[PDB]
Amino acid sequence: HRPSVVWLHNAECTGCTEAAIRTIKPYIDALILDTISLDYQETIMAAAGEAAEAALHQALEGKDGYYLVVEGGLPTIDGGQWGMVAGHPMIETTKKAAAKAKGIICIGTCSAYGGVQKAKPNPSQAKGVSEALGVKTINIPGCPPNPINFVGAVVHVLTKGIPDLDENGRPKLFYGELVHDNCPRLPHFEASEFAPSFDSEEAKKGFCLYELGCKGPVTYNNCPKVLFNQVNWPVQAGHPCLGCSEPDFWDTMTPFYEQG
Amino acid sequence: PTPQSTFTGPIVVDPITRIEGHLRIMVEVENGKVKDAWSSSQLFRGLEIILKGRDPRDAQHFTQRACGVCTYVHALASSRCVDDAVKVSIPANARMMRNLVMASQYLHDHLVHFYHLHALDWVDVTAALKADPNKAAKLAASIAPARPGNSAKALKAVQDKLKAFVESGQLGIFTNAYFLGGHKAYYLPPEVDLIATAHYLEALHMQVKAASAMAILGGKNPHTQFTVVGGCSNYQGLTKDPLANYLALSKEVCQFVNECYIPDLLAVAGFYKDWGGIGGTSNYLAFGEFATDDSSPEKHLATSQFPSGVITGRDLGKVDNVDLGAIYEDVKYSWYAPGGDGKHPYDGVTDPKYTKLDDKDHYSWMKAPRYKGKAMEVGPLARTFIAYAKGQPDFKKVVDMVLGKLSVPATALHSTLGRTAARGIETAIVCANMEKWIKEMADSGAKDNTLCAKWEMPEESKGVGLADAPRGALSHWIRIKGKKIDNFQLVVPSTWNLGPRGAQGDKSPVEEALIGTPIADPKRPVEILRTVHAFDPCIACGVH
Numbered sequence: 001h002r003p004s005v006v007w008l009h010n011a012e013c014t015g016c017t018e019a020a021i022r023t024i025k026p027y028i029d030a031l032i033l034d035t036i037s038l039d040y041q042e043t044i045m046a047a048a049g050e051a052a053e054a055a056l057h058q059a060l061e062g063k064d065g066y067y068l069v070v071e072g073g074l075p076t077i078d079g080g081q082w083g084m085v086a087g088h089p090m091i092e093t094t095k096k097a098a099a100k101a102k103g104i105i106c107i108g109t110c111s112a113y114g115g116v117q118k119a120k121p122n123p124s125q126a127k128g129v130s131e132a133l134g135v136k137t138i139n140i141p142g143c144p145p146n147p148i149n150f151v152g153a154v155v156h157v158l159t160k161g162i163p164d165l166d167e168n169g170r171p172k173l174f175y176g177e178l179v180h181d182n183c184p185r186l187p188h189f190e191a192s193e194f195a196p197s198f199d200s201e202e203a204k205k206g207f208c209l210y211e212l213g214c215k216g217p218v219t220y221n222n223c224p225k226v227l228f229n230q231v232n233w234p235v236q237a238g239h240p241c242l243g244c245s246e247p248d249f250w251d252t253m254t255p256f257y258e259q260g
Numbered sequence: 261p262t263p264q265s266t267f268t269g270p271i272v273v274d275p276i277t278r279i280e281g282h283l284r285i286m287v288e289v290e291n292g293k294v295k296d297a298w299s300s301s302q303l304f305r306g307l308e309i310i311l312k313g314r315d316p317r318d319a320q321h322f323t324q325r326a327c328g329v330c331t332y333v334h335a336l337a338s339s340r341c342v343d344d345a346v347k348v349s350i351p352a353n354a355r356m357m358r359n360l361v362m363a364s365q366y367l368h369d370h371l372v373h374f375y376h377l378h379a380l381d382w383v384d385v386t387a388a389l390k391a392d393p394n395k396a397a398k399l400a401a402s403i404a405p406a407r408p409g410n411s412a413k414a415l416k417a418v419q420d421k422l423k424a425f426v427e428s429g430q431l432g433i434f435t436n437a438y439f440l441g442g443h444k445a446y447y448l449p450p451e452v453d454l455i456a457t458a459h460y461l462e463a464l465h466m467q468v469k470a471a472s473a474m475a476i477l478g479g480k481n482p483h484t485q486f487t488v489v490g491g492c493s494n495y496q497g498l499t500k501d502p503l504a505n506y507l508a509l510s511k512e513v514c515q516f517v518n519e520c521y522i523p524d525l526l527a528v529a530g531f532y533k534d535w536g537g538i539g540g541t542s543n544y545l546a547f548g549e550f551a552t553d554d555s556s557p558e559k560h561l562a563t564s565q566f567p568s569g570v571i572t573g574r575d576l577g578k579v580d581n582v583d584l585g586a587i588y589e590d591v592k593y594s595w596y597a598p599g600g601d602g603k604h605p606y607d608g609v610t611d612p613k614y615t616k617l618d619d620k621d622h623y624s625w626m627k628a629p630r631y632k633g634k635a636m637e638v639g640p641l642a643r644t645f646i647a648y649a650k651g652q653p654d655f656k657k658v659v660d661m662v663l664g665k666l667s668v669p670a671t672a673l674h675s676t677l678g679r680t681a682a683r684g685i686e687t688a689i690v691c692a693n694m695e696k697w698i699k700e701m702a703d704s705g706a707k708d709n710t711l712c713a714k715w716e717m718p719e720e721s722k723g724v725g726l727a728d729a730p731r732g733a734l735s736h737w738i739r740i741k742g743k744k745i746d747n748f749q750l751v752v753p754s755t756w757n758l759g760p761r762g763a764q765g766d767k768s769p770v771e772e773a774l775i776g777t778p779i780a781d782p783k784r785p786v787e788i789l790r791t792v793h794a795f796d797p798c799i800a801c802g803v804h
């Protein structure tokens with residue numbers, strides 16, 4: 001028997017699902033064949049419609065219980081009808097699935113904190129999972145988060161228990177350090193060597209991107225340490241950090257190309 | 261003959277799984293065939309509303325989150341859009357880098373779609389257990405190049421792994437699969453099921469490599485971070501070592517496309533020949549992609565190596581030029597306020613007004629984009645017909661190769677089978693161009709690493725960004741006022757393909773394609789999935 005995992009998609013772009021399948025320790029096939037039982041996942045599951053909905057119920061009714069992964073924020077306006085699956089408001093199905101879950105893992109800034117659809121003026125009245133349900137969640141933010149961080153947290157929760165969280169529900173294992181503190185451009189920052197524009201010689205020489213809006217100094221994530229796709233990260237590609245793992249970054253980190 | 265029940269009655273499939281986003285399909289069935297259809301998108305986010313009043317430089321970061329499956333493409337469209345609004349012509353290297361990242365995205369996107377989203381509609385995974393592995397190996401040896409992953413040992417290993425999974429009774433993502441316990445609409449012999457399933461697992465690994473290649477130039481995947489107004493920020497992406505690695509990875513991915521993807525697509529298509537007469541539409545549109553000149557939207561349209569164009573009524577002899585002024589969106593059958601019909605995207609309005617579930621008068625969060633009164637299919641099939649009609653050498657070669665292999669006329673491509681084939685066709689063509697495109701940017705970058713041009717934010721302006729994303733013709737339209745976003749409208753390929761009826765009550769491409777779909781078993785309507793999935797729906801994209 002492999003531990004049951006129910007994965008719900010709410011108000012999301014599916015970038016978090018995509019991030020998750022970029023895992024290489026283990027690869028996704030090995031994860032779902034050997035380590036977990038992924039019992040509902042709309043992006044890749046075979047069943048559709050009534051058959052899919054029956055698959056969800058079978059998982060929610062499972063004798064061994066289940067862990068809940070939530071992707072996307074919850075649109076709450078008009079009784080939650082602006083976001084629906086199988087004729088039910090997303091808020092309704094997420095509430096129900098969360099009630100008897102062994103644990104709740106929010107993959108991405110959207111489920112964790114509200115995300116892009118919550119940004120002003122928030123026409124769908126989108127909320128993060130913890131706010132909408134009124135329960136604590138394990139938050140794995142980033143837009144999307146590193147698969148290392150998501151799979152890392154899943155494994156930890158299944159084997160060891162709940163990992164130490166910060167004030168924003170993020171595992172200290174992955175979000176304990178500022179991006180900036182591990183950035184290879186830090187010497188330039190310390191020396192006040194800033195690129196004034198993307199076309200400047202300074203930018204060509206790899207100068208710090210702080211003057212171009214880099215939110216690395218206020219962003220908790222492990223991007224420079226672990227990289228993405230085993231090859232790169234935004235600052236290495238010459239672009240400032242957006243602060244995408246911070247709550248409500250869409251409204252607290254903008255304008256993205258300024259520090260104002 | 262095509263298995264068909266006698267069922268008369270409605271069928272609702274919600275959720276449509278193995279797509280991006282939340283789609284509800286409703287159909288009326290009579291004597292086992294769909295007679296009417298509705299494409300009902302079930303989520304609204306409202307990125308266009310959220311963008312109002314914001315810094316135009318921020319738009320690409322918000323719009324990229326329109327979709328994480330077709331990641332990058334919206335950052336690209338927004339950047340082209342703002343670049344046009346501020347009237348900046350990006351450096352040659354930036355055009356090259358932006359186009360290569362789009363090429364990498366096509367490779368990743370199409371592989372995942374065929375195997376992990378579409379394949380389960382044609383392949384019976386559990387039947388793979390009944391296959392003779394040795395027999396499967398020799399079969400695979402006849403329809404595709406020699407490779408260790410196609411040996412009896414390797415195929416048996418897959419079958420054993422699958423066998424242990426099924427025997428556990430925890431079927432996970434295969435729970436209640438339409439093919440469990442046999443299904444008349446699934447035709448493949450067990451050996452083919454095993455071969456396809458082995459490649460399905462290989463492709464889960466290969467898509468990681470595809471994403472890594474893309475991230476070398478993109479910074480990360482999903483959601484790239486290398487584009488800026490006036491070009492790109494990734495100076496390292498022009499250097500020798502990273503591009504050597506980019507080429508190496510890209511060739512691995514391309515080997516898998518040519519060894520596994522195309523041969524499986526051809527094998528599957530030969531068994532489902534009847535699907536070459538189901539799910540056709542008549543009008544095709546493409547903005548084109550991979551241009552040699554991206555200094556303006558018109559230069560993009562004229563110089564795209566995958567050409568732009570408009571085909572109407574299946575007439576492969578009259579490919580018209582795209583008229584950007586002719587595009588508009590209707591809201592009559594959508595969840596938006598009345599009086600929003602016929603809006604050109606520069607005058608686009610997004611005023612949500614929900615009614616109720618299954619209201620025939622308003623049944624979707626997608627707008628209905630129309631072109632001179634007609635619905636337009638966009639995507640790989642659209643690009644393929646247009647390129648074929650214009651006599652694009654690569655498209656001529658690869659399409660004729662496919663038409664030969666399946667022994668059908670070019671008219672058979674107007675179908676769900678054709679729609680599926682075209683996705684494989686252009687993937688092979690992208691692969692064939694990779695080494696050339698890379699060498700171009702490698703040589704160029706070595707000589708002069710200029711990557712971002714100077715520009716100035718205008719007080720008042722408008723601009724449009726065009727791209728042909730993996731699913732089709734994408735456009736972002738901006739009005740700038742007081743140096744801020746006054747209006748920002750997205751018109752996305754899935755909006756074209758899967759939106760609701762227009763103001764005249766004319767069906768969208770998916771709704772028309774579903775008419776005439778045979779239903780072998782109403783409770784397991786795999787045929788609806790086959791056609792819907794062939795359009796490669798992206799609902800977060802379509803609604804935004």
Ligand code: SF4
Pocket residue numbers: 011012013014015016071072107108109110111115116142143144145325328
């Ligand atoms: S957190 Fe970002 S990547 Fe994940 S679903 Fe939300 S918008 Fe998409």
Ligand code: SF4
Pocket residue numbers: 179180181183184185186187189207208209210214215216217235240241
């Ligand atoms: S580039 Fe950003 S993260 Fe790196 S040193 Fe500068 S401010 Fe810090």
Ligand code: FCO
Pocket residue numbers: 327330333334729730731732734752753754755797798801802
């Ligand atoms: N491809 C893709 Fe996504 C859609 N539809 C976009 O643009």
Ligand code: F3S
Pocket residue numbers: 142143179219221223233234235240241242243244245
């Ligand atoms: S934008 Fe996000 S992915 Fe890392 S580099 Fe900054 S936190």
Ligand SMILES: [Mg+2]
Pocket residue numbers: 308627749750751752803804
């Ligand atoms: Mg729009």
Ligand code: NI
Pocket residue numbers: 280326327328329330331798800801
């Ligand atoms: Ni998409």
